[PDB]
Design an enzyme around this catalytic site. Structure first.
Site, PDB file in Angstrom:
ATOM      1  N   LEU A  66       0.806  -1.211   0.000  1.00  0.00           N
ATOM      2  CA  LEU A  66       0.000   0.000   0.000  1.00  0.00           C
ATOM      3  C   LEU A  66       0.852   1.281   0.000  1.00  0.00           C
ATOM      4  O   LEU A  66       1.936   1.331   0.593  1.00  0.00           O
ATOM      5  CB  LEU A  66      -0.940   0.006   1.205  1.00  0.00           C
ATOM      6  CG  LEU A  66      -1.871  -1.206   1.344  1.00  0.00           C
ATOM      7  CD1 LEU A  66      -2.688  -1.110   2.635  1.00  0.00           C
ATOM      8  CD2 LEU A  66      -2.770  -1.346   0.115  1.00  0.00           C
ATOM      9  N   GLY A  67       0.357   2.303  -0.688  1.00  0.00           N
ATOM     10  CA  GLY A  67       0.909   3.644  -0.578  1.00  0.00           C
ATOM     11  C   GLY A  67       0.496   4.285   0.739  1.00  0.00           C
ATOM     12  O   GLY A  67      -0.677   4.312   1.103  1.00  0.00           O
ATOM     13  N   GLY A  69       1.317   7.671   3.543  1.00  0.00           N
ATOM     14  CA  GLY A  69       1.481   9.105   3.388  1.00  0.00           C
ATOM     15  C   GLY A  69       0.137   9.707   3.032  1.00  0.00           C
ATOM     16  O   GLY A  69      -0.751   9.023   2.519  1.00  0.00           O
ATOM     17  N   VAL A  74       4.474   7.680  -0.273  1.00  0.00           N
ATOM     18  CA  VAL A  74       5.495   6.844   0.326  1.00  0.00           C
ATOM     19  C   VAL A  74       5.285   5.420  -0.109  1.00  0.00           C
ATOM     20  O   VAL A  74       4.170   4.906  -0.067  1.00  0.00           O
ATOM     21  CB  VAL A  74       5.485   6.928   1.852  1.00  0.00           C
ATOM     22  CG1 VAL A  74       6.703   6.224   2.405  1.00  0.00           C
ATOM     23  CG2 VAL A  74       5.497   8.375   2.302  1.00  0.00           C
ATOM     24  N   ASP A 175       4.489  20.502  11.315  1.00  0.00           N
ATOM     25  CA  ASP A 175       3.285  19.698  11.180  1.00  0.00           C
ATOM     26  C   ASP A 175       3.490  18.371  11.914  1.00  0.00           C
ATOM     27  O   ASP A 175       3.546  17.302  11.278  1.00  0.00           O
ATOM     28  CB  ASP A 175       2.987  19.456   9.699  1.00  0.00           C
ATOM     29  CG  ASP A 175       1.680  18.681   9.448  1.00  0.00           C
ATOM     30  OD1 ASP A 175       0.735  18.784  10.263  1.00  0.00           O
ATOM     31  OD2 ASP A 175       1.601  17.988   8.400  1.00  0.00           O
TER      32      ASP A 175
HETATM   33  C1  LIG Z   1       1.170   5.151   7.255  1.00  0.00           C
HETATM   34  O1  LIG Z   1       2.240   4.435   7.838  1.00  0.00           O
HETATM   35  C2  LIG Z   1       2.915   3.400   7.117  1.00  0.00           C
HETATM   36  C3  LIG Z   1       4.421   3.195   7.417  1.00  0.00           C
HETATM   37  O2  LIG Z   1       5.170   4.143   6.696  1.00  0.00           O
HETATM   38  C4  LIG Z   1       6.544   4.451   6.725  1.00  0.00           C
HETATM   39  C5  LIG Z   1       7.554   3.522   6.998  1.00  0.00           C
HETATM   40  N1  LIG Z   1       8.860   3.858   6.987  1.00  0.00           N
HETATM   41  C6  LIG Z   1       9.159   5.094   6.692  1.00  0.00           C
HETATM   42  N2  LIG Z   1      10.460   5.412   6.685  1.00  0.00           N
HETATM   43  N3  LIG Z   1       8.322   6.066   6.382  1.00  0.00           N
HETATM   44  C7  LIG Z   1       6.993   5.783   6.380  1.00  0.00           C
HETATM   45  C8  LIG Z   1       5.999   6.906   6.092  1.00  0.00           C
HETATM   46  C9  LIG Z   1       4.626   6.797   6.130  1.00  0.00           C
HETATM   47  N4  LIG Z   1       4.081   7.987   5.881  1.00  0.00           N
HETATM   48  C10 LIG Z   1       5.029   8.927   5.695  1.00  0.00           C
HETATM   49  C11 LIG Z   1       4.900  10.275   5.411  1.00  0.00           C
HETATM   50  C12 LIG Z   1       6.045  11.016   5.262  1.00  0.00           C
HETATM   51  C13 LIG Z   1       7.272  10.400   5.376  1.00  0.00           C
HETATM   52  C14 LIG Z   1       8.452  11.122   5.240  1.00  0.00           C
HETATM   53  C15 LIG Z   1       9.477  11.770   5.147  1.00  0.00           C
HETATM   54  C16 LIG Z   1      10.739  12.563   5.076  1.00  0.00           C
HETATM   55  C17 LIG Z   1      11.671  12.074   6.154  1.00  0.00           C
HETATM   56  C18 LIG Z   1      11.290  12.381   3.711  1.00  0.00           C
HETATM   57  O3  LIG Z   1      10.477  13.901   5.278  1.00  0.00           O
HETATM   58  C19 LIG Z   1       7.392   9.043   5.678  1.00  0.00           C
HETATM   59  C20 LIG Z   1       6.263   8.256   5.839  1.00  0.00           C
END
Ligand SMILES: COCCOc1cnc(N)nc1-c1c[nH]c2ccc(C#CC(C)(C)O)cc12
EC number: 2.7.11.25
Length: 335
Positions: A66-67, A69, A74, A175
């Site tokens: 899944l996407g 973010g 992401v 944020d």
């Molecule tokens: C919904 O949760 C699922 C798990 O998601 C993640 C797992 N691992 C990482 N590193 N980022 C994520 C991640 C999820 N949503 C995000 C939104 C923004 C960011 C980011 C960033 C930076 C560090 C590039 O600003 C990472 C994530």
């Protein structure tokens, strides 16, 4: 001339294995502007080949996890030569802010997502960072409805260490909220992500955040009154946001949403801080500590380090971290 510019020009047109500082510099070029493929990579695990790092050629996103973010930006990805796996955040080039990288580049608090690099390719900037298998805090609260006081207290504490770190590096996050805190596999560790709204601070004036072209604002429901009144803004903005997240974790809903329809920003301006959203159920020191982070005047509001102390104390008094991270669903609080 600038010796500085000579170094930056040495970086352009290619992606290279390099350091935080190089990435940081080359990034600022991206904010200011076969449209080149360039960038720098921070681990050996993500390796450029012949001056390049192109999507579908050298790295592949996993069709399909899944996407995640807010904009589904992401994705799980893999390096095709190396076999190492991590996350990409896509950011559109014409709105890329170099603060996003500045905020996580190199020296590493464990409360800040590890940055594995970034490369630009076409209309995208691809940001690479350690996959955190645990998910977002926002996912957690949605799956559990809302969280036990000890867990909420515990994650708030680890966000506050991260903030304390950034605020020491003179960057505010802009944020903070559950969707932008990531969990480790066992749920034991939290780190901040999504520094796309971060800003730096200087001697010490205190920039008025919004008003500007540059700046896109944080989550409306979590923004501090000095932001919304168009007042002077600083790090205290994240401590307000962090207490709104706290209220999110406890009640299973964002502040304000359950009381007014919108626009909510005017209510944040006009009305008392949403301490009336604190559950009566809670321990004295929990309530006390939220009260001190939701002071409308940022001069009067506790710092991140200060608040952190208060929550570690509230964690004592409530009896330590006891509840498992994924237990019973808990009914969200009703309107
Ligand atoms: C919904 O949760 C699922 C798990 O998601 C993640 C797992 N691992 C990482 N590193 N980022 C994520 C991640 C999820 N949503 C995000 C939104 C923004 C960011 C980011 C960033 C930076 C560090 C590039 O600003 C990472 C994530």
């Amino acid at each position: 001339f600038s010796v500085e510019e000579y170094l930056v020009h040495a970086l352009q047109g290619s992606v290279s294995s390099g350091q935080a500082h190089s990435l940081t510099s080359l990034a600022k070029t991206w904010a200011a502007r076969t449209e080149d493929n360039e960038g720098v990579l921070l681990t050996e695990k993500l390796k450029p080949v012949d001056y390049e790092y192109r999507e579908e050629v050298h790295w592949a996103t996993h069709q399909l996890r899944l996407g995640r973010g807010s904009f589904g930006e992401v994705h799980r990805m893999e390096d095709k030569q190396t076999g190492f796996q991590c996350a990409v955040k896509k950011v559109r080039l014409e709105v890329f802010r170099a603060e996003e990288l500045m905020a996580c580049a190199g020296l590493t608090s464990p409360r800040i997502v590890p940055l594995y690099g970034a490369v630009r390719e076409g209309p995208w900037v691809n940001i690479f960072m350690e996959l955190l298998e645990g998910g977002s805090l926002g996912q957690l609260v949605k799956e559990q409805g809302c969280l036990p006081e000890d867990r909420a207290l515990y994650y708030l504490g680890q966000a506050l260490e991260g903030l304390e770190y950034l605020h020491s590096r003179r960057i505010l996050h802009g944020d903070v909220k559950a969707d932008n805190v990531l969990l480790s596999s066992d749920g034991s560790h939290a780190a901040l992500c999504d520094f796309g709204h971060a800003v730096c601070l200087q001697p010490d004036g205190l920039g008025k955040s919004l008003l500007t072209g540059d700046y896109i604002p944080g989550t409306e429901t979590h923004m501090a009154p000095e932001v919304v009144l168009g007042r002077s803004c600083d790090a205290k903005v994240d401590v307000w946001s962090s207490c709104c997240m706290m209220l999110h974790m406890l009640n299973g809903c964002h502040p304000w949403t359950q009381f007014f329809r919108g626009p909510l920003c005017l209510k944040i301006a006009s009305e008392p801080p949403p301490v009336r959203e604190i559950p009566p159920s809670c321990a004295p020191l929990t309530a006390q500590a939220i009260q001190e982070g939701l002071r409308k005047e940022p001069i009067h509001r506790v710092s991140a380090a200060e608040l952190g102390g208060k929550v570690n104390r509230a964690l004592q008094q409530v009896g330590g971290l006891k509840s498992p991270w994924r237990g019973e669903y808990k009914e969200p609080r009703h309107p």
